[PDB]
Amino acid sequence: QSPAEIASFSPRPSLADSKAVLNQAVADLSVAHSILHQVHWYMRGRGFMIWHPKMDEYMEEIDGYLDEMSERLITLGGAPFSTLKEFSENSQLKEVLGDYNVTIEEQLARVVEVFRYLAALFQKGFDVSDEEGDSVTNDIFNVAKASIEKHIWMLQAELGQAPKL
Amino acid sequence: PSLADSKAVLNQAVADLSVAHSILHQVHWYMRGRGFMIWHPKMDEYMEEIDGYLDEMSERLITLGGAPFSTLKEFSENSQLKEVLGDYNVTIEEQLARVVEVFRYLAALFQKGFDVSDEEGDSVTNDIFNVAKASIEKHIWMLQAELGQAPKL
Amino acid sequence: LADSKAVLNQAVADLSVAHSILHQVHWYMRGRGFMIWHPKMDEYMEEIDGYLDEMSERLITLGGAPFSTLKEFSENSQLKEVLGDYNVTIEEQLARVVEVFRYLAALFQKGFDVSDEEGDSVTNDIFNVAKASIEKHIWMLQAELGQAPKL
Amino acid sequence: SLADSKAVLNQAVADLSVAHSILHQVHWYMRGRGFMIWHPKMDEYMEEIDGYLDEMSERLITLGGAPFSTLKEFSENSQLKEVLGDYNVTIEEQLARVVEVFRYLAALFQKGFDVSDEEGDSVTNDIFNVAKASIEKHIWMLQAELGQAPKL
Amino acid sequence: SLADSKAVLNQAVADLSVAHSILHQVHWYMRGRGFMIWHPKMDEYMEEIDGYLDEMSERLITLGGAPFSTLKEFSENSQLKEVLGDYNVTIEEQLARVVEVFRYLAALFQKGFDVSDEEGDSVTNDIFNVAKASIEKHIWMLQAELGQAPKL
Amino acid sequence: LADSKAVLNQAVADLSVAHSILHQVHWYMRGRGFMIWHPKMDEYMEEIDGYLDEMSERLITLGGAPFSTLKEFSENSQLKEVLGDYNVTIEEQLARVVEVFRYLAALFQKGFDVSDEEGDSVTNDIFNVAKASIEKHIWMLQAELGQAPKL
Amino acid sequence: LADSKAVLNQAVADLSVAHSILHQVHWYMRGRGFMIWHPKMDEYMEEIDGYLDEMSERLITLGGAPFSTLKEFSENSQLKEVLGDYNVTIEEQLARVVEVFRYLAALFQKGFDVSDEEGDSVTNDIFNVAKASIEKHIWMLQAELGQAPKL
Amino acid sequence: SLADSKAVLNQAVADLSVAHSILHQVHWYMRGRGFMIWHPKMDEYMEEIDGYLDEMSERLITLGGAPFSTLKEFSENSQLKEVLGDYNVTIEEQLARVVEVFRYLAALFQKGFDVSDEEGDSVTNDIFNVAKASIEKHIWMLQAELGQAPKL
Amino acid sequence: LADSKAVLNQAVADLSVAHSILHQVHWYMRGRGFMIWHPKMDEYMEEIDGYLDEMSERLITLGGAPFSTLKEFSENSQLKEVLGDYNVTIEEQLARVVEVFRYLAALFQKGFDVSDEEGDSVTNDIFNVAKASIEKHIWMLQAELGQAPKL
Amino acid sequence: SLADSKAVLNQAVADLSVAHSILHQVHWYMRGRGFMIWHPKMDEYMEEIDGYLDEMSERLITLGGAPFSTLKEFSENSQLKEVLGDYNVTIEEQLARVVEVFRYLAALFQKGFDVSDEEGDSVTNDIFNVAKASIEKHIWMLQAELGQAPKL
Amino acid sequence: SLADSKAVLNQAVADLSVAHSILHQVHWYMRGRGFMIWHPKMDEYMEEIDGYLDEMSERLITLGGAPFSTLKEFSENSQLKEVLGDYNVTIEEQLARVVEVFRYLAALFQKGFDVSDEEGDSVTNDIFNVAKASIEKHIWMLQAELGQAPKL
Amino acid sequence: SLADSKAVLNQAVADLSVAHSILHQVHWYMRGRGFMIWHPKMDEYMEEIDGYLDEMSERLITLGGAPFSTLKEFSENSQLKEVLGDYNVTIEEQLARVVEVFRYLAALFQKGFDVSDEEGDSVTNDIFNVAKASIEKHIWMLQAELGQAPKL
Ligand SMILES: [Ca+2]
Ligand SMILES: [Ca+2]
Ligand SMILES: [Ca+2]
Ligand SMILES: [Ca+2]
Ligand SMILES: [Cl-]
Ligand SMILES: [Cl-]
Ligand SMILES: [Cl-]
Ligand SMILES: [Cl-]
Ligand SMILES: [Cl-]
Ligand SMILES: [Cl-]
Ligand SMILES: [Cl-]
Ligand SMILES: [Cl-]
Ligand SMILES: [Cl-]
Ligand SMILES: [Cl-]
Ligand SMILES: [Tb+3]
Ligand SMILES: [Tb+3]
Ligand SMILES: [Tb+3]
Ligand SMILES: [Tb+3]
Ligand SMILES: [Tb+3]
Ligand SMILES: [Tb+3]
Ligand SMILES: [Tb+3]
Ligand SMILES: [Tb+3]
Ligand SMILES: [Tb+3]
Ligand SMILES: [Tb+3]
Ligand SMILES: [Tb+3]
Ligand SMILES: [Tb+3]
């Protein structure tokens, strides 16, 4: 005979170890990137000429974390999500169709939402990596969390609000 | 001459670009209102690009055996663009609206340049207009976006 | 796919999928040649992002609305992604890259054809430049694999 | 013999030190549309202000003087008044505050220009003139953002 | 009010705009041995003319004035005369036109200098001083190519 | 100094005064070594400026309100300023910088301690980076003075 | 694509010979204006070399086999070479570069036409870009020589 | 108090000096397909190694310690063993040798991390961490070229 | 090859042919290693071009008349060219380069010796620097081919 | 009409050439603790002296003058005195010597400033002013190294 | 044939390795006025020494030799002696030690020159020549700091 | 036993200084078609001459010598003779003057080369060789401009 082929529902979704949460990051950072690109492209209104370019800067920073976090996952022996289907299903951020009729304030507020989520994800990754004693991974999350939180201050300040982290 | 018209539209461009530069200088200088700090330096970027086209088009014309307009009287009399005196009381959005309008004219100019030069088989001149049109159109998108509008080319 | 705006948006989806695949090759790569090709994938991706931005933004300039969600990229792209696997050779990785680049070169030909018919010379040149470059890469990638470009 | 020149140099040291402090408060406490342009702009202004403070302090040293060099001295000799940071100053208000400070500095620099000319200190004179040039350009730009004429 | 400082700044705007046009004509129409050096040199002169033009107009704005800003205003106010482009002018003759334009500029800047000195406009006075220094150096140089003394 | 915010604001006050002392040192310096040590103060000042901005901004980020007036810096800082004097020797100037730095090293360790205990990991690493560089500067200044770092 | 491929290879022959002529002009130049024109041949040579590589590599990408020996170059090229001679005037050497450029400009027009007929838009832009630049140079050289470009 | 941290820092000075010797050996004796990529890559590794060895040695000095600083000290104290150069070794063996050196450093740097953590030396702790992060990435890449998992 | 002048001109001829051959290797290359060795042929050609210019120009300085036509290069060179072929393996290409370089080193040695005996120190230095560089390359290429330099 | 401006420019050309010569002696014959920083510093001072000499020489040409241009002219018209190099001179003495030279030049630039101001040559006046500022700053610095006030 | 050229090149590998290690000890153990200038200067020396070390071994490889490549080999073959690091050495003593090292290396490089001169290995000969020129420059400078003649 | 190498090094210091002065005169006094190119070209030559002067003097110092270091010493030991600057001299005459100085220098570097070969001073030999190579290349270029062969 032969070993039976197991048929069960996709197991994961529980952020229990460093590996798990690094992959969740790969997923969320890929979608974040896509949301950022849509804001870049669909943006209209006073303040476009400053924020259009800014989205590029954010995107590059997000790219940087995406790469180092999946590559840390690889180094630790894991297997990073690497298809749009994987990214789209494992991510907790929702995507919507691009729309040109959104005010600047609403765009910036959407980016703050995404940044708040990512900062909590990196907080979770920090805590998990600390508990498991994976100090390298721990530092990666902390660094990413530092600058995301700083971007949240600035965005909120443009919106006339405190960071409210 | 086989290339008489390429020549004529290149020189039209020389005149209109010189006028366009002038207007962008006026916007840069007379600008007042929230957004000054971003748009004032942006006019410099536009001017540098307009300048780059003015030089390239005039010199393509020289290369083809033409005599480019090279006096303010010539630019002025030949250009289809109309200049008005500077006024500090124009709003930032009216200033950007004017820039979009100058740029729309230039896109149509470069379109005609493109067609005429494609007609006469001057493929170098064709490319020059094609590159200029491409850039100007991108600029129109951005300006319109800032104005809360679609590019509407 | 019979106007410039549809071909451009199709390119948005396909370049987005091509970028994802190039990333997968970057990460899962193993074997002799890794030290040269792993970094090369970043060059390829920087380029693909280059075109993605220019095309999407040409569409916008032309009054279109780019695919801008993963669902849209995935469903609209003609490219097929598979799960990442470490157990693929460098030569196999390269061959996959060439397949994708071949697909892109052909998409760029259609964009070239369609915009030429429509008299949209700006879009036409964007497709033209992207093609010249994709084609150069296939020559080089095929050469590493000991084969002619076979365009 | 260069006593009036020395006094105005040192007065500028106090004032520039306070001005720098105010720019730093505006930079941190800024909130509202245009933050993203004006926040970094505050660094540009601070660098320049630091540039003058150092240059003028060292011109004073070079003349045989002794520049104020403590926060107490800066705060007590300066004519500018500082206030507790407040996040609810609007952008426009923040810009108007920088304008008030720059106008003060332009007038201080005028006085320094005049006094150094009177004492025949031509090097000190050109130092104030350069500073004045650039400050007035900044007032022109600030006021333009505010939709106003430079009003020098 | 600095009425004449403003008047000379605006005269400079007009004349530099015409000077710039004249240098462009020389760049384009130039033919003869020396072309390869002087053709590009015309770009360097234009960039410098451009610099003054923007600095002077911007100093005018800063002072409360309203710079000339249309080609008609440039032509009607400039003292410089423009002629149609001709390819049959020699290099030596082109260089002679430039010297003549620059001798004019240097005289204009002397007036700008004298007027701003007199009105106590030291910033403007420096702007003119810097422009005149540069222009006069160029004159020495062009004259030297032409085998002649600067004859300032 | 009740928490992370409190210590951040203390660093804001102390870094401001520390920067002022450094400028005093830069300006009133005389003696053999001037030519190396005078410009070196500029390097120290840029670094202190950097910590000052980063720490105040971390405080902003966290919902605090940084000291931002000279009175506030002066009031809250634990460093004491004295009038400039040209007759201080170069090695005496370097010793005052060492004292100021040892003070800032201590401050930053309290900062590190407090943030660690509160779980403010970003603030923690900020004080740690600051601590590392100051302690290296102490080693180098003490070395110049013929002494061990004596942390 | 036989005709596109043939004109590309022709250009390889002729650009290799043009390059050698420029190198001769560079070395054998004597007369007033040497100091401006001697380095200018280095810029011309650099640019010629860029076309040469670009055009044979295009040919490779198309599945051709570019001429690649001095024999192939001399035999296929329509340019004729003469022994070096220091007795040539500066103006004479410039006229010889003008002649050679006028020739390449014509060849590039053939290449452009042929490629346009065969639908090879990529080769077509390559010829178009080379021709834009050679013609600018001819204007400039002719102007140094007191003449209209006469294209 | 900080004796254990000082001890591991000094161990690292020793092992890093030998490591760097081994990389230089690889660099010079390398032969085979891939020489052209890997030979200069050893240079990257050496300079990164030199970087850690200076940082760590200077952190030891800063703590009041006395770094090993003679070839005899390095050899005696290093746990890494050196062998004679041999051109006959294969590229893949050369790379396997670099991996085994790095796996050792990574383990050493983890010991440093742990020791310094227990002692409260947070600066020393962060130096090992950054070192460890870097080396582990290198092991992944080196293993990748050899067709293997990182096995960390 | 009687004297310094004569060997300088000989090198102009051989360096021209060597550059030709390197370019052939750059273009016709196929197989694993292409991605590192294709661009490596650019660094080599660049270097060869440096020597060729320096050597001919030293000869002009010396009052000679450097070869300046492809006919002179081809007829005077001891190096021999073959038709381009895609079927040559990477290692064969690499070994071709080695053999050209070995010839060049031997030529430069003769150039060194000849200018030495004529007391032309400048020409001597030129051949020395050229030699040291080529031998370094020979070690490196041989290393790739799994062999000792065997000078 | 411009004779005194031309005179003091040409006197500066001579003194600047001798001063360059002196600084090069100091550079070469220097020995003593402090060499490693003061040796390269003399290069910086020489480049600056060179800049003034070229600028002032060329202002003189521009004005229709004829700069001193031989070592014999420089040596004979200079108020500065040269002696044979000697390795025994201490570092303080070397530095005190450069100060004396700088003091002379600063004074010479003051005469130049005065004279051009009288003759209304504002461009020449600015050149002397700029030169004077920088030299006085270096005097402060060298005096400070020497443990002293600038005592301008 | 080239056995003696190879042998001295290999002597150089071992000595430059030990020279580098002594420079590193000097860099780490330095204490005294001058530290902030001389500490970085040891880095520059170390860089230059590595430069020679890599080039000489690679020249050896190129010639068919096998360079020393283990700390054991460097130690055994070097004629330089190493002692434990001591903080209580003065800056002047530390510099005198470098001067001793360099004096040795320049004697070595002269032997390398003469040997290769004899064996007609003109490339190896230029390498030693370049190295010697540079080391002798540094000996002049270090000695000048020490108030001494170069005394080659 | 080193002494003639030192004497040629010192003659070079004198002649290079004089040559630097002559090039400066040509820079300033040049008039005529070609000015715009040859005027800046003199700068390049002067920077190069200063390069040699400094390297040669410092090699002399390194050898335990005492370089000429006053204008009088340069003037009286130089074989080159200076004349009063004159504007009327043609461009072609000026270049010929530089050619004549460069031929003197190449010949002097040849004597330098030979004397240092005989004395076994390889470092100095190499300095003269390098200088000679570049001077000869300039003669070619200058001669080419004047429509002549180099005639070395
Ligand atoms: Ca709405
Ligand atoms: Ca008036
Ligand atoms: Ca005391
Ligand atoms: Ca004459
Ligand atoms: Cl502006
Ligand atoms: Cl990577
Ligand atoms: Cl973009
Ligand atoms: Cl910030
Ligand atoms: Cl041009
Ligand atoms: Cl300073
Ligand atoms: Cl050359
Ligand atoms: Cl290529
Ligand atoms: Cl250090
Ligand atoms: Cl003449
Ligand atoms: Tb990566
Ligand atoms: Tb142009
Ligand atoms: Tb974009
Ligand atoms: Tb300062
Ligand atoms: Tb402006
Ligand atoms: Tb900040
Ligand atoms: Tb290529
Ligand atoms: Tb260090
Ligand atoms: Tb050349
Ligand atoms: Tb000059
Ligand atoms: Tb190496
Ligand atoms: Tb020197």
From Swiss-Prot, chains D, E, H, J, K, L:
Subcellular location: Cytoplasm
Oligomer status and interactors: Homododecamer. The 12 subunits form a hollow sphere into which the mineral iron core can probably be deposited. Can store up to 480 Fe(3+).
Family statement: Belongs to the Dps family.
Residue numbers binding Fe cation 2: E58
Protein's gene: dps
Entries under PANTHER family matching the protein: GENERAL STRESS PROTEIN 20U
Catalytic activity as recorded in UniProt: 2 Fe(2+) + H2O2 + 2 H(+) = 2 Fe(3+) + 2 H2O
InterPro entries: DPS_DNA-bd, Ferritin-like, Ferritin-like_SF, Ferritin_DPS_dom
Protein name in the entry: DNA protection during starvation protein
Enzyme nomenclature, EC number: 1.16.-.-
Domain notes: 12 di-nuclear ferroxidase centers are located at the interfaces between subunits related by 2-fold symmetry axes.
Function: Protects DNA from oxidative damage by sequestering intracellular Fe(2+) ion and storing it in the form of Fe(3+) oxyhydroxide mineral. One hydrogen peroxide oxidizes two Fe(2+) ions, which prevents hydroxyl radical production by the Fenton reaction. It binds and incorporates Fe(2+) iron. Is responsible for hydrogen peroxide resistance. Does not bind DNA.
Superkingdom of source: Bacteria
Organism: Streptococcus suis
